[PDB]
C-alpha cells in the first residue's frame, strides 16, 4: 500500500476528514521533503499539499511527491483554508504549539480542529526497501566509526575523548551522531542517562558504549559493553546475562510476535539470572526518521511486529555505585525471522 | 530587583494570576536548575516552586533556589492543582503542546489557563554578573577555538573539515558548538540558511566562519570573515562595508538606544556602499540560555537596550552566484555605553 492508502484508514478511524501533518519526521515520511522543518503537508479530501517557502522552489520541486503550495505562514495555511472549510482536521497535538493550533484556528474559522494524540504512533513503523537501505547506510557507518575507535578505548582515556572521536569521524563522513553520545566506564556503566563524562577509564573496567548516526535523514543505533582488563567477576556474570537476554530477545524476533512478549523473554531471563530488580524498563524501539519511534518494548505494548520494521533490542541491568551493562543491536524483521544489522564486535569479557 | 519580582508585574499586566513555566530556559532563569528539560515552575500566589522527579533529587537540593516537590507527571501538576483552585494560569503557548495543555486542563478543571504569546519575549534581556560571567567563559572558548583553528582555513580544506575541527575542539573543552556550524566559502558565502559543506576553500575566496560556544549552559555568538588568497575587487568592498556597518553599529550602543535604530544605521550604511538591495533583514538578538533570545534588532522591533544586556550585530551581504560577508560580535550593554566581548582578530582582506 501507499504511504497515503496506509495514512487515510488511519484518519477514518480517528474520525477525521482531513489531517495537519506538522511533525518534519512525517512532512517527509509522506512527501520526501528533506528539509521538512520548513514544510507541512495537508492532507484532505481534495488530495495533499506540501506548503514550503520560496527558498525550496526548486529542492521541493525535485524531492516532493505532493503538488507543492509556495508560501511563507500564515499565507500557507490561509489558501489552505477553503479546502477545509466544514472539515473536520486533525493535528498531531503531540507535535503542534498551542500558539500554531491558535493560528490555525483564526485561520480555519469554518473547520473543526480535532486533536490527536497516538493516533499516528508507529504510522510509520513498517520501512520500505528504499528506506532501509538509507537506515543500512547509516548503521554501516555508525560500525565503521565504531570498529576504528574501539582500539582507543583502554586505560587512561576519558570517557569524553572517546565520545569526541566517535562525534569527529561520523561528522567527517558526512554524518552525525544521532544522539547524544554515551560511553560509561565503571560506576558510570549503572548510571542509564549518564553520557560521556571526563571520567578516565582504568583497568578492571568495563565500558558502555551507546551511539548511533545520521545520514541522509535517516538513523541508526546500538549499543556495546567492552573490557578494559579484567573485570570482577560480578561484573562479567552481569555482562554475559545481558548478552545472553539480548541474543534470546532478538531470535523470538517474527512477522506477528507481541513487542510485550519480548519484553517479558528478556526480564524474565534476567531474573532467572538473579538480575530481576536491576533491568531497563523497556526493551527497545523503532528507528527510522527519528532515533526513537514506534513500535516499542514495554511490558504495556499492545505493538506487534511485521515484516520491514526496524528496531532495537536493548537488555540492560545496572548495580548503583558498581557498575551495569547495556547491549543492543538494530534489527530488520523479516517475513519468517529477522536480520541484524549491526555488525559491529561484541565481545567477550 | 529579584528575578521573580522582575516576572510577577509582567504576569499582572497579562491578566493572569499564576504561571506555569515550561520552557527549559525559563525554568532555569528562575530557579537556577540545570537538567531544565526535566523540570517545571508554577508561580502563584503561594510562592513558587519546582517540579521535578526522584533522579534529581540531590542535584534539584542543590541548585534551586525554589522549593521543590519530587514526582512525575501527572502527579506534578496534579499536585499543584489546589494551589491554582479558582486561578488564571498563564502558561507558555510558543512552548507548550496542545497535548501538553490538554493534560493540564483535565488536571485543573477549576482554573483557567491563559495562553501567553510574546508576553515573556525579552524576560532574561537583562544579565546579572554571574550571568555575563558564564557567558564570557563561553566566548572565551569560542575565541581560543577559532583562534586555534584560523590558521587550518586555507586552500584545500573543506569547509565542512574545518566545522568539524571547531566541534572537536570545543567538545573536547567541556563545552559544545551552540549551533550547527557555518564555515562557508566563495559562493557559498551567498547563502544564508547555509551550513558547512564538502566544497573545498580556493585561493580568492572569502570564508565565513559562524560558530558559537554553549558552556555550562550559557551561549556565546560570533562571526568571522577571512580571505584565503587575494579576493576580487568587487568582494572586498563588500567586506570593507560589511565592517564598517558592523563597527558603525557597535559604536550606538548604549542604554536607551532603540533596536531598530541600530538596525536602521546598518541598514543605511552598507546602502550609501551599493549594498541595499542585498543585506541581512535582522541586525541581531540577545545571546544567554538560547542563542537567539530577547531583544530583537529588526526595523519593526520595539526593544530598548539597557544595561546587562548581551546581544549580537551582525550586517551582512549576499550577492548570489558570487559570495557573501557576515561579521559579527558579542556585545554587553553598560552604563554608558559597550563592551566587545568576543575577542577574536578581525582582519583585512
Ligand atoms: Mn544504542
Ligand atoms: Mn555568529
Ligand atoms: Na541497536
Ligand atoms: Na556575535
Redesign the interface.
Same mark, same amino acid.
Given at each position: 500500500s501507499s504511504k497515503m492508502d496506509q495514512l487515510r484508514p488511519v484518519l477514518g478511524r480517528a474520525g477525521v476528514d482531513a489531517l495537519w501533518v506538522s511533525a518534519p519526521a512525517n512532512v517527509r515520511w509522506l512527501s520526501g521533503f528533506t528539509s521538512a522543518e520548513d514544510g507541512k503537508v495537508l492532507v484532505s479530501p481534495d488530495g495533499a499539499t506540501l506548503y514550503t517557502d520560496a !527558498?525550496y522552489t526548486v529542492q521541493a520541486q525535485e524531492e516532493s511527491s505532493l503538488p507543492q503550495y509556495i508560501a511563507r505562514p500564515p499565507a500557507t495555511y490561509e489558501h489552505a483554508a477553503d479546502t477545509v472549510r466544514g472539515l473536520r482536521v486533525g493535528?498531531e497535538? $503531540?507535535?503542534? /504549539?498551542? %500558539?500554531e493550533? $491558535?493560528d490555525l484556528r483564526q485561520a480555519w474559522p469554518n473547520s473543526t480542529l480535532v %486533536?490527536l !494524540?497516538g493516533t499516528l504512533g508507529g504510522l510509520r513503523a513498517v520501512k520500505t526497501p528504499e528506506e532501509i537501505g538509507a537506515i543500512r547506510a547509516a548503521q554501516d557507518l555508525a560500525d565503521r566509526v565504531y570498529t576504528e575507535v574501539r582500539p582507543m578505548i583502554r586505560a587512561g582515556v576519558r570517557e569524553?575523548?572517546v %565520545?569526541?572521536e566517535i $562525534? /569527529?569521524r561520523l !561528522? !567527517?563522513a558526512?554524518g552525525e551522531s544521532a544522539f547524544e553520545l554515551i560511553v560509561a566506564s565503571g560506576p558510570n556503566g549503572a548510571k542509564p542517562?549518564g553520557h560521556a563524562s571526563?571520567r578516565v577509564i582504568e583497568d578492571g573496567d568495563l565500558v558502555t558504549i551507546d551511539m548511533g548516526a545520521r545520514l541522509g535523514g535517516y538513523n541508526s543505533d546500538m549499543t556495546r559493553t567492552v573490557a578494559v582488563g579484567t573485570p570482577s567477576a560480578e561484573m562479567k556474570r552481569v555482562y554475559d546475562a545481558v548478552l545472553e537476554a539480548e541474543e534470546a530477545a532478538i531470535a523470538a524476533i517474527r512477522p506477528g510476535v507481541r513487542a510485550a512478549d519480548l519484553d517479558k523473554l528478556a526480564r524474565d531471563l534476567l531474573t532467572r539470572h538473579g538480575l530481576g530488580e536491576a533491568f531497563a524498563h523497556s526493551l527497545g524501539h523503532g528507528v527510522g526518521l527519528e532515533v526513537h519511534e514506534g513500535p516499542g518494548l514495554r511490558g504495556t505494548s499492545q505493538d506487534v511486529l511485521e515484516a520491514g520494521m526496524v528496531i532495537t533490542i536493548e537488555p540492560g541491568a545496572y548495580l548503583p555505585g558498581v557498575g551495569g551493562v547495556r547491549i543492543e543491536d538494530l534489527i530488520l524483521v523479516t517475513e519468517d525471522g529477522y536480520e541484524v544489522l549491526s555488525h559491529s564486535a561484541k565481545e567477550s569479557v
Open positions: !527558498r493535528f497535538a $503531540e507535535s503542534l /504549539t498551542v %500558539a493550533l $491558535e %486533536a !494524540r569524553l575523548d %565520545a569526541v $562525534e /569527529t !561528522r !567527517r558526512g542517562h571526563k
